[PDB]
Design a protein around this ligand. Structure first.
Ligand SMILES: O=C(O)Cc1ccccc1O
Length: 167
């Protein structure tokens, strides 16, 4: 048993809810929250800008030190950093950004990072401002992640369409 509440069960291991991931993280304090990161860990908008704002910019300060030491992530890659006031850990995962021309086949590689963690609170990778088909992102999630994932869909109209189209 875990602390996640009000989720619709899609599969053995994937759950979904219409929720603000920031507000969900603040309530649950999950072991792992996933950030929709870019390779530079520049947290400006969407999930990253919202998560970073909720940490009072401490996520960005920590991220800048990580990049200064290690250089940029790979598209499809990840790193584990602090969850600050939101979670124990933040798994920063880089899905491909369609609005930068990145290979959508890298979305499966991105979701494979989730398998290193038994339970996660996450957004749909590459959805919204990343320019990919969200319905596609949910299918790749279900067909790739084997650990227990609680998806927070921010946009209500996107949530209802994802549920009503789910195979
Ligand atoms: O609603 C979601 O969860 C998907 C998403 C991600 C980023 C920006 C806007 C947006 O709708």
């Amino acid at each position: 048993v875990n602390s996640f509440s009000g989720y619709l069960k899609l599969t053995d291991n994937v759950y979904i809810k219409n929720a603000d991931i920031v507000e969900e993280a603040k309530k649950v304090k999950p072991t792992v929250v996933v950030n929709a990161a870019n390779v530079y860990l520049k947290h400006g908008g969407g999930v990253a800008g919202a998560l970073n704002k909720a940490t009072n910019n401490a996520m960005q300060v920590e991220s800048d030190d990580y990049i200064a030491t290690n250089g940029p992530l790979k598209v499809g890659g990840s790193c584990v950093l602090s969850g600050h006031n939101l979670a124990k850990h933040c798994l920063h995962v880089v899905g491909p950004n369609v609005n930068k021309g990145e290979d959508i086949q890298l979305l499966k590689s991105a979701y494979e990072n989730f398998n290193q963690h038994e339970v996660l609170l996450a957004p749909l990778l590459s959805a919204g401002i990343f320019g990919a088909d969200p319905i596609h992102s949910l299918r790749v999630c279900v067909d790739t992640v084997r650990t227990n994932v609680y998806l927070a869909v921010f946009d209500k109209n996107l949530y209802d369409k994802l549920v009503s189209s789910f195979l």
